[PDB]
Design a protein around this ligand. Structure first.
Ligand code: RIT
Ligand code: HEM
Length: 462
């Protein structure tokens, strides 16, 4: 109740906060739904409270440009001050201020145009295994749980291109990396440990001293230990040397990246490479199965650019007009990060009102992606909205990978291996909804964008 008068003090609209909880009780419907309702109810700018933390939501593209680009280094340098996390504070998505600039600069050469071109044969090989394993479920005639097999593909791709190691997750029913990584998705806003940090932020140093973390400790330890084995095997074996993500961090120690810092960056990449890639792929295939005209029209383009099921090329992947439209439209309906989050490093006036230091500024990506002002009938899947040329698309309304220095470091990587998977499977298969298919697709109410029930489809040849 201490800060619960800040937004009325500035003449900013917003829902009335509950004394101890603020507006967190309104997250029960889903953080995406709360931002949508607030966007329609209030204007271009509304204020909420996560416990004591004041949260300013902005939708003016001119204002969004200021916080994400112009004043990114000036003020909005840090994303969000998370609770008790332990050594994971050095992870790039959690780092702050100059430490983040150092980590980001060191990791930036990971995804250049040349490095994307070199890892293409690695990704293409996993795609062959993907088509081979998906054929077995098709010839049997059983429904396919998309998040399983496409999750194994994503886990294989990220580990193979970042650490040069083939863990064979596509052919491992009990793959340890997937079992570990999917534990990051279980935590939600109404979890007792996390909810206590929201309501009582002063508990974060307490749990830190007690060595309690918001992250699953079994998962953190397995990945840290498993990554440390791949690093030691990289130094003893000079023949297995590739200029990749893991190597780039090993070269940092010649100057300087800690073993914990190296483990922190690896955990982010493994989680991002597995979860986001497989989630969006499962939405794309859901939208294709529920829109057969779009799927067959997408297959028509593939068979033309790659005649006779020809293996794709790097350039042929980035040439495809309709494929880029299908992926961009999936990311419009299902932006996996509901919002873009920035924290005021100092006191700043944003849109005229003065915002105190420590407050959070939020760009409601999901709400702006579903705005009827920018998208006619926003709940419908129409790849025709987009073209491969994005000259007309506002960079601050359509933000599936964020914008500015803090944008997604792996956007080009994520778009490549998703398109490669789609090309490979669509030139060999067609996806149909079945009895277990949930239509319409209901979104989950906790954390990242996830289906309420796992997406299952039937897969046939051709
Ligand atoms: C930490 C994890 C176990 C928890 N998940 C939850 C579920 N919830 C409500 C959230 O995650 N809610 C919020 C959130 O999504 N924050 C995030 C917003 C975001 C989204 C996309 C890209 C970049 C940043 C920002 C956070 O720093 C998380 C922390 C993290 C790290 C490793 C593994 C899992 C999670 N970062 C990521 O998920 O980065 C991975 C990604 C990179 N590119 C796309 S996803 C925060 C309150 C954490 C509670 S605790
Ligand atoms: C469909 C796939 C993906 C989507 C939609 C996505 C989306 C996003 C978004 C919205 C952000 C925040 C942008 C901002 O705050 O301005 C982000 C940040 C980030 N992404 Fe992704 N992501 C994807 C895949 C990946 C992959 C595969 C990797 C790495 C292999 C990755 C690495 C990162 C990192 C490290 C950050 C934080 C960068 C920083 O804080 O400086 N992402 N991503």
């Amino acid at each position: 109740t201490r800060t619960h008068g800040l937004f009325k003090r500035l003449g900013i609209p917003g829902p009335t906060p509950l004394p101890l909880l603020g507006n967190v009780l309104s997250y029960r419907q889903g953080l995406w739904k709360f931002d949508t309702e607030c966007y329609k109810k209030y204007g271009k700018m509304w204020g909420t409270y996560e416990g004591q933390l004041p949260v300013l939501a902005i939708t003016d593209p001119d204002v969004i440009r200021t916080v994400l680009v112009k004043e990114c280094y000036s003020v909005f340098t840090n994303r969000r001050s998370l609770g008790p996390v332990g050594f994971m504070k050095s992870a790039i998505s959690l780092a702050e201020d100059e430490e983040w600039k150092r980590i980001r600069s060191l990791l930036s050469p990971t995804f250049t145009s040349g490095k994307l071109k070199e890892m293409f044969p690695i990704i293409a090989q996993y795609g062959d295994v993907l088509v081979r394993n998906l054929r077995r479920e098709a010839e049997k005639g059983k429904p396919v749980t998309l998040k399983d097999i496409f999750g194994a593909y994503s886990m294989d791709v990220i580990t193979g291109t970042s650490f040069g190691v083939n863990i064979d997750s596509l052919n491992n029913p009990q793959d340890p990396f997937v079992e570990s990584t999917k534990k990051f998705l279980k935590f939600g806003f109404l979890d007792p440990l996390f909810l206590s940090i929201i309501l009582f932020p002063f508990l974060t140093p307490v749990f830190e001293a007690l060595n309690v973390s918001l992250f699953p400790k079994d998962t953190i330890n397995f990945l840290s230990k498993s990554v440390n084995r791949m690093k030691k095997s990289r130094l003893n074996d000079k023949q297995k040397h590739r200029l990749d993500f893991l190597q780039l961090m090993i070269d940092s120690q010649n100057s300087a990246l800690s073993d914990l810092e190296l483990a922190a960056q690896s955990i982010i990449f493994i989680f991002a490479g597995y979860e986001t890639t497989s989630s969006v792929l499962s939405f794309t295939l859901y939208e294709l199965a529920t829109h057969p005209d779009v799927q067959q029209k997408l297959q028509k383009e593939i068979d033309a650019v790659l005649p006779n099921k020809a293996p794709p090329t790097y350039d042929a992947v980035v040439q495809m007009e309709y494929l880029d439209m299908v992926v961009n439209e999936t990311l419009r309906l299902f932006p996996v990060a509901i919002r873009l989050e920035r924290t005021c490093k100092k006191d700043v006036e944003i849109n005229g009102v003065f915002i105190p230091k420590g407050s959070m500024v939020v760009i409601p990506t999901y709400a702006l992606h579903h705005d009827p002002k920018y998208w006619t009938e926003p709940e419908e899947f129409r790849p025709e909205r987009f073209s491969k040329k994005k000259d007309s698309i506002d960079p601050y309304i359509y933000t599936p990978f964020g914008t500015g220095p803090r944008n997604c470091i792996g956007m080009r990587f994520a778009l490549m291996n998703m398109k490669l998977a789609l090309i490979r499977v669509l030139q060999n298969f067609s996806f149909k909804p079945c009895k277990e298919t949930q239509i319409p697709l209901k979104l989950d109410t906790q954390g990242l964008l996830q289906p309420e029930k796992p997406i299952v489809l039937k897969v046939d040849s051709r």
